[PDB]
Amino acid sequence: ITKDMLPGPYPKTPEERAAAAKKYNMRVEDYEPYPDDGMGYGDYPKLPDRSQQERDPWYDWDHPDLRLNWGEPMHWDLDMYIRNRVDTSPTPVNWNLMCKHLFG
Amino acid sequence: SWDKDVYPEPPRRTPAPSPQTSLPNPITYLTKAFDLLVDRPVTLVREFIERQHAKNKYYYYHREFRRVPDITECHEKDVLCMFEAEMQWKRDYKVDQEIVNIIQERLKACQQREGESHRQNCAKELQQFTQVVKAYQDRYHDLGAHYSARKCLAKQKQRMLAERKATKEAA
Amino acid sequence: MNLFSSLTLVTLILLTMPIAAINFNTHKFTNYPLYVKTTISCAFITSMIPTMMFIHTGQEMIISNWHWLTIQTLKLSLSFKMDFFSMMFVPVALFVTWSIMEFSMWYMHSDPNINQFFKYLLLFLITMLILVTANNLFQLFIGWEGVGIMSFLLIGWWYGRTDANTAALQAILYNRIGDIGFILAMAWFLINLNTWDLQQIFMLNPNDSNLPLMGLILAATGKSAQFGLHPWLPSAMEGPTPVSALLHSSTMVVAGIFLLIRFYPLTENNKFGQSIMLCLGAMTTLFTAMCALTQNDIKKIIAFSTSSQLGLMMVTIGINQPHLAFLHICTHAFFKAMLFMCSGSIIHSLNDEQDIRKMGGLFKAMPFTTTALIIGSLALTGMPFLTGFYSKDLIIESANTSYTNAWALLMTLVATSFTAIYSTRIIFFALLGQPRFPTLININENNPFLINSIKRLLIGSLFAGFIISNNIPPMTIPQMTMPHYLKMTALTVTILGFILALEISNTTHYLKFNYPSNTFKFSNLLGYYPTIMHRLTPYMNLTMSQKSASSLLDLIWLETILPKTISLAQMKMSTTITSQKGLIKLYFLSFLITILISTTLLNFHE
Amino acid sequence: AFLPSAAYLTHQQKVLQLYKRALRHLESRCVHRDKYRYFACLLRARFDEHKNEKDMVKATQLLREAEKEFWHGQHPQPYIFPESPGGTSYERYECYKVPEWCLDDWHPSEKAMYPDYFAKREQWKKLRRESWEREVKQLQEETPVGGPRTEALPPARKQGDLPPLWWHIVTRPRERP
Amino acid sequence: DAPPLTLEGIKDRVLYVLKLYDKIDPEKLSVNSHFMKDLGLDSLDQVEIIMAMEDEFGFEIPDIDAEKLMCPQEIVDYIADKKDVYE
Amino acid sequence: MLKYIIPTMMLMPLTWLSKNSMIWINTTLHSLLISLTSLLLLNQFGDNSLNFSLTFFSDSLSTPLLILTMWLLPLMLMASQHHLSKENLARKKLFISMLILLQLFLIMTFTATELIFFYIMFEATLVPTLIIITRWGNQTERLNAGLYFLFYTLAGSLPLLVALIYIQNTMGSLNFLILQYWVQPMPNSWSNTFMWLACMMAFMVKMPLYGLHLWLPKAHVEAPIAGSMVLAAILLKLGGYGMMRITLLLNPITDFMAYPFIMLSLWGMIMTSSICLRQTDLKSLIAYSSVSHMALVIVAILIQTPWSYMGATALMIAHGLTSSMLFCLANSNYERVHSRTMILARGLQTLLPLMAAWWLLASLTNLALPPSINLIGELFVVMSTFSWSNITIILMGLNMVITALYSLYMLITTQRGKHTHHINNILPSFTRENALMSLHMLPLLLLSLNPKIILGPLY
Amino acid sequence: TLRWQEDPEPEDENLYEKNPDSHGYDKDPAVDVWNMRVVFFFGFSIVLVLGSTFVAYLPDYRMQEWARREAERLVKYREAHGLPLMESNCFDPSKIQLPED
Amino acid sequence: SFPKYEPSRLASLPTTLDPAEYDISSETRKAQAERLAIRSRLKREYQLQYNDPSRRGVVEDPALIRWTCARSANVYPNFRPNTKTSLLGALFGIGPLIFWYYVFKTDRDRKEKLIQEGKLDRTFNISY
């Protein structure tokens, strides 16, 4: 491991964004960092915020339990979105319908 | 054995078995088998152990403490007398804790022995428990983890001051 | 007196002996499950003797045999209190565990870790019998946490499966909320009554006992899976079928109702707790029955069935009938365990296929399992002069002719009809009709262990309710003078439920396709309760556990204010001090300034 | 949209996947076999009615409307096979799947109980270490520059050699060890 | 419980369920009979055949492998790979 | 107390004149002999403490800490002999000498009757600990961790020295028995307020208190295994012991002056516990668990009831044992997989069954499973805080959830599931690691049988 | 880019290769066995067992049970002379001089 | 007709109901080809260094180290004190402390007032 592989500050110029997307092993137009609100996120990408239950259960992963691949940029809350924890998978009926029916 | 005056128990009253049927109950047969197969070898082994203990006899004694003057006759910041007064107070404190424990054990024994008539047949034990709990609470409560004889004396002085003042209001 | 205590503690020591036997092992044990089964059967006999003695005489005893810890005024000793409840609940649990272990030694034969499984089951039974025979609150708390941890381990038995780990952790969470309630009750009892033993609690008999009853009701809600803390009981059958047969059907889940049974004078001298726990029990039994109406997993159906039964136990506690609740525990354990053994037999005969839409036509193929399942369903519904009739119907006999909540009574009658409905749903879909399993047929039930254990629990579910109901002494005034339309309420409700559910199944036989409504999706997705909360309560915790506590406070602001602002201040002062250009002229100008300040302003020369 | 063989999913593949999941959900709703046969033949007729469609945007609109139909008509809990993901016994035996390299850490006292098995294991390891450099030298000369564009692997080209990266797909543990 | 499988047994099984199809003549098909090439079948008929395979052997074949099996011998090879037959 | 100081100081010629191959054997043997010798401090009386001379004494509070320290030294010697196997002999002897000096300073800190002697060796414990952390720590951040630890401790504890010298000038003595018999009440003034703050803040930092705990998740992580044992099992308890000693003189201002700090722990033990739910690091998880347990100890000391004091003593001993065992397990995993992150190595019950059993038992003792002394201490603190106020039980009960919610979580991701495929250097468990686990755990379960020897001086 | 002279990181050593009977204490087999014997002898059979025997037979720890015996005296006195079982004052109120007010 | 399904935070939109799946533009094909190329490169590297018979140890992952360094050691240098961070720190840092301090102070003041007036029931309370 070398010092240029660790995450750095928030990128502003397009060439720093390109180098960051090259660092995180993703396309330049697919790399969207967190907004620069000074919350310490830095240049870590903002993933589409889906649980690990939503991944393909039949494609052979490098980590079959985690449903993850070696070298893939993992989510900021991957320790939150594992299959042992909170799931975001779609439901047959709507969320507001469930809340209204249960509360009623 | 233990002393029956400290731990009181009423003489028991066991009814005679007067059966009304002809089927033999298994309890009597199992009891006879119990004094046959269990009680006899246990008692024989205990007799052998008791003979071996009677072969070699020695004694031990209950330690007695004489009375040292308490904190009320101790000069302030005179550690030589206050140390003895505080040691006596702590020994007394432990003794009173065990006294309250004995009364609690008496109350629980009364409740279990009486069974379904416990709230009538255990009035005396409950009154004794209330008296000893009231006196313990008036003697030792609200001192803290750093309790000492001086804090107990201050609490008692405040209680007697309050009692005298309340008497003076209603006189 | 000497035979009594000796035989009871022999039962306890005999139960704890094989744990030491396996822990001191070196070789490969020559069929350790047979050793455990023989030990538990012998302990069943040894505990049957003092139950017979109590039936003959009426002896209740308390053995404070080992003094443990004197916390000044408080004294804690190893105390066993054996009364009506403990002495009539120990042998029923031993008989059920004997049948469950025989079914386990048949069912789990291919497991290479079968010795660990039998040791875990023995440890759970040890903790349960520690719980039910405890006198002080510390020992009963020990049994409470022991059965919780053993439930965790037995649910997460298949530790490679993530669903088993999730279910075990969820059960731990709900049991720890029950532990919050139990801890609050113990706290009030120590602070206000200066005791943990039950004798002083019952003798002092407090009147302002709302808070300890609230804590005990919270603990019973957590352990027995009432409403609010229910979904761990259905969701925690990822483990083996003997585990679901012993843990979540007959023995562990009645611990909350047992705890409320032990504290029956405090509940009998308070109406607010009785009212709210009656309402909670009726809500639980209606909710779980309505969920079980449209379920398709057989073990999920039986889980909702036993949770509805626990709700009925809560209801009959709430109307000041605790001995009826204990009799219902002893009655319900038999046929609930037996139904789970029958379910496991069908699962094993169909190669681990648990969906009810892939089984059928098993009436003639598996006749003994069919007969036992039919008898168990009839006993669960409340067929007259079976075991359930000797408890469950009597509960309704007190539910009508008493000063109860009207809505609670109406929903528990609707719940009774729903129990009838899902019982015949199980019977129709599992047994009758035409086959739906794969073409290769490996149907077999000819093993001595499974047949013998099912036969033993069949004899139990046929006669034990009659035996216990005619052997226990009357602890209350039975209510029998009532009108004819209150006497036959339960039987008529069960019959009409049978008719409606038979009509429902016949309409499933019709050649029509219909889209599901909102009621079907509400009753199929578990009232939307494990879908909202299990997605909302973790999320609102875990982000709060990461964005605020982990990052914003500990990693940013507490790092900012105390050490780093100080470090920046000293760095800035150090840079300002040592920014000198090394010029003697400025140094001597500073000397002149210092002398002038000390003479004129600071007045150091006076 | 996530496949090891193709980058994307074609329209025919989407239609076939929709037909598969719709038939499975209909089988879930229609537990009895004859009723399922009636409505499965009805669904087959409904899929065969628009089979010969040549306008691509009309086929795409029909596909989207059929997806909306299916999502409105799901079973809240469909039937899952016991070993498929979401099933009752999915990944149950993964605690028993011990990898074979643990056999390298066995004591010689317990290795003496299985002589022929460990001789065969030694010859298998010898074959692997004999073929590994051939496999990697085949891997460098087959793929174009800039890295492989697909995850698919070449087979054993010449004679007397083994396919590249074969050890962890041949020596994988059994389903029921 | 769980009787062992064998290659000729599973081949007999897949052929036996294949001759029970009304779209297939039992006197023409062999173990290398393509569906839309040698038998003139359809893609939807291949999907129904794969669902029959799943309902016969009790395990579900994934779609990304269901779109590749085109002959009975390929289904035999896939079932043999997934069930680890002939140890 | 000279019968324990002299053999401890003679351990240095024992470890400096030994051969290059038998330093570990000799040091472990003689430290185990000293641990056996340590049992002669149980001669405690129901009224009077055990006074040896004018310089040393030991009541029933210091005795379990002394026994724990002299039992803990051989455990560190057995643990820290694998990552120093390739080390130079002179540096190995220097490491053993640092451990010996730390034990000597600790066991004469716990027995000093005079308060400034207690302060002097309470700060003499800084030097070997800091040297160990900054010398034999692995990664870059050991230097920053050492700076943070040293400066938090000293900047908190210099006003303690000023206040103690003020006490010596005012009361006339600093002997604890004389102060027990010459204690005067402290009235309400700003001078007494800052007197209380100066006496308390050193132990607040060393406890650690929430908001002053920032040196714990560094110094507990960058340090080696023996450094982790002393950091989690003695020094925090040393701060607690000093707090118990010095709260005697600060009455009755404490009855309001402890009002903020209790909140700073009552909420604090929530937040840090929640951190363990979202920690990517195993050692950091153990450190934050230590923060939560010691915050509970802080509340127990500050409400100053007898039940809280016995709960604090039992909790300190049990938490020291459990945290040391957990650090040993995490260090074994780090030695096997060469990374500290928790998610890298999974499913280790399939490969290491007995170490999985030790993991399960350690996690069960972490979440206060009855009848262990962890549950005894937690329970007694719960009773005392319920007597203090009612709503506190909520702040207890929620904690009783979250603790388990990380402990079993720590049990799952390290032991359950499917194992990592590419990690194939999982060697079978050595006899040394299993012996270390058993020597950590069996005294705890044996102490569950006879807990009355660790229930404080007012049992 | 040219970089400084530095030894590469050595490969991780396995103690079970050169010594399949290793206890994990040392590379030398005799030293390994003697260290294991020393640890197991002086830890389990010297400190643990004898320490448990010592703690189990402590001579009346903290005078505790002695107080119980004293209670069995005191109540036996105070139930025999008709005295109150416990007084509400720790010290004699006669010998306490309250301040006047 | 049919009720439209809308996404939520805890219930995402299904893949089959997403319009963006059905977009068959050439730019989407190029994007998916580049994503597949990146995935194939990473998979090839992983299973090249993973199938090696000589290697014994851990195949380290730069993404895991990147994630840990971003989660732990990169939070402070990318933090800037502004109105949002200061208001969040003051709201969630000293809010609950003040709230619980006021609650406990109020309860204990009421309890002490009741105790010193001889109103609270403290009959059997002798263990504190």
Q: Which helix (H) or strand (E) holds C74?
A: strand C74-82
Q: Which of F384, F391, F425 sits opposite H56 (nearest CB)?
A: F425
**Residue C355: phi, psi to the nearest 5?**
-70, 140
* Closest residue by Cα to residue C529 from C247, C290, C246, C364: C290
**D136 min Cα distance to partner chain E (Å):** 25
Write out chain E residues lying below 8 Å of C351, CB-based. 1-2, 58
C31-45 burial by CB neighbour count: b if 16+ within 10 A, else e?
ebbebbbebbbbbbe
In DSSP terms, which residues pair with C62 in a beta bridge? C81
Distances (CA, A) of F347 to D98, F342, F343, F418: 10, 11, 10, 5
* Closest residue by Cα to residue C392 from C320, C484, C322, C313: C313
Q: Which of H93, H124, H128 sits opposite C557 (nearest CB)?
A: H93
d(CA D140, CA F301): 69
**C343 min Cα distance to partner chain E (Å):** 16
- H 49-88 near D (Cβ less than 8 A): 50-54
Write the CB contacts of B169 (distance below 8 Å, at least 6 apart in sequence). Answer: none
Cβ contact A84–C556 (<8 Å): no
Query: What are the structure tokens assigned to C52, written together?
Result: 């017979």
d(CA C551, CA H70): 11
Q: Please tell me what DSSP assigns to residue B74.
A: S
Tokens 């993850």 — which residue? A68
Cβ contact G71–B99 (<8 Å): yes
Name the packing angle between helices F431-447 and G29-43 (round to 10°).
Answer: 0
Check if the beta carbon of residue D17 is closer than 8 Å to that of residue E50: no
Closest residue of G to D105, CA-based? Answer: G16
**Resolved by:** cryo-EM
Say if residue C536 is exposed, middle or buried (CB neighbours under 10 Å; 0-12, 13-18, 19+): middle
Cβ contact F78–G39 (<8 Å): yes
Write the CB contacts of D156 (distance below 8 Å, at least 6 apart in sequence). Answer: D162, D163, D164
Check if the beta carbon of residue C427 is closer than 8 Å to that of residue C373: yes
Query: What are the structure tokens assigned to C8, written together?
Result: 């009871």
d(CA B65, CA H116): 38
Say if residue F271 is exposed, middle or buried (CB neighbours under 10 Å; 0-12, 13-18, 19+): buried
Closest residue of C to F369, CA-based? Answer: C145
Write the CB contacts of F214 (distance below 8 Å, at least 6 apart in sequence). Answer: C554, C558, C559, C562, C563, F148, F152
Q: Are strands C74-82 and F57-58 parallel, antiparallel or unpaired?
A: unpaired
Write out chain H residues lying below 8 Å of B100, CB-based. 126
Neighbouring C-beta atoms of residue A30, cutoff 10 Å? 14
d(CA D44, CA D21): 13
d(CA D139, CA D164): 7
- F 271-290 near A (Cβ less than 8 A): 278, 280
Write the CB contacts of D63 (distance below 8 Å, at least 6 apart in sequence). Answer: D11, D14, D15, D18, H22
- H 34-53 near F (Cβ less than 8 A): 46, 50
Cβ contact H63–A70 (<8 Å): yes
Say whether the peptide bond before residue H77 is cis (omega within 30 degrees of 0): no
Distances (CA, A) of B63 to B57, F48, G68: 20, 16, 12
- For chain H, the residues whose C-beta falls within 8 A of a C-beta of chain A are 3, 5-6, 8-14, 31, 34-35, 38-39, 42-43, 45-46, 59-67, 69-71, 74-82, 84-85
CA dihedral sign, ordered F382, F388, F390, F396: negative
d(CA F279, CA F187): 45
Q: Which of F277, F375, F416 sits opposite C159 (nearest CB)?
A: F416
**C524 min Cα distance to partner chain D (Å):** 7
**D107 min Cα distance to partner chain F (Å):** 10
Query: What are the structure tokens assigned to G60, written together?
Result: 């009346």
Query: What are the structure tokens assigned to C429, written together?
Result: 């879909």
Experimental resolution (Å): 3.2
Neighbouring C-beta atoms of residue E72, cutoff 10 Å? 21
C91-101 burial by CB neighbour count: b if 16+ within 10 A, else e?
bbbbbbbbbbb
Write out chain H residues lying below 8 Å of D148, CB-based. 37, 40-41, 44
**Residue F128: phi, psi to the nearest 5?**
-65, -35
d(CA F119, CA F106): 11
Write out chain D residues lying below 8 Å of H19, CB-based. 64
User: Which phi-psi region, left, alpha or beta, contains residue F347 (left: φ > 0; alpha: ψ -120 to 50)?
Assistant: left
Cβ contact H65–A95 (<8 Å): no
Q: Which of E1, E55, E56 sits opposite C442 (nearest CB)?
A: E1
Distances (CA, A) of F63 to C15, F44, F50, F109: 38, 9, 10, 12
Interface D-H, measured as beta-carbon pairs within 8 A, has a size of 67
| F442 in contact with C, Cβ within 8 Å | no
Please, do chains E and B touch (3+ CB pairs < 8 Å)?
Answer: no
Say if residue C74 is exposed, middle or buried (CB neighbours under 10 Å; 0-12, 13-18, 19+): buried
Cβ contact C556–H79 (<8 Å): yes
Which of A58, A59, A60, A61 would best serve as a mutation to test chain E binding (most E beta carbons within 10 A)?
Answer: A58
Check if the beta carbon of residue D98 is closer than 8 Å to that of residue H31: no
| H97 in contact with F, Cβ within 8 Å | yes
Closest residue of H to D151, CA-based? Answer: H40
d(CA C116, CA C122): 10
Cβ contact H3–D72 (<8 Å): yes
Cβ contact D168–H44 (<8 Å): no
Write out chain A residues lying below 8 Å of D76, CB-based. 92
Closest residue of H to D2, CA-based? Answer: H36
Check if the beta carbon of residue C167 is closer than 8 Å to that of residue C238: yes
Neighbours of chain D (3+ CB pairs under 8 A): A, C, E, F, G, H
**D42 min Cα distance to partner chain C (Å):** 11
Please, do chains G and E touch (3+ CB pairs < 8 Å)?
Answer: no
Interface C-E, measured as beta-carbon pairs within 8 A, has a size of 18
Q: Are strands F57-58 and F50-51 parallel, antiparallel or unpaired?
A: antiparallel
| F445 in contact with C, Cβ within 8 Å | no
Active site residues of E: 42
Write out chain F residues lying below 8 Å of B77, CB-based. 181-182
Tokens 């006074």 — which residue? F51
CA dihedral sign, ordered C432, C436, C441, C447: negative
d(CA C522, CA D120): 59
Closest residue of B to H124, CA-based? Answer: B133
Write the CB contacts of A78 (distance below 8 Å, at least 6 apart in sequence). Answer: A52, A68, H67
Write out chain E residues lying below 8 Å of A59, CB-based. 64
Q: Which of F349, F351, F418 sits opposite D102 (nearest CB)?
A: F351
Say whether the peptide bond before residue F371 is cis (omega within 30 degrees of 0): yes
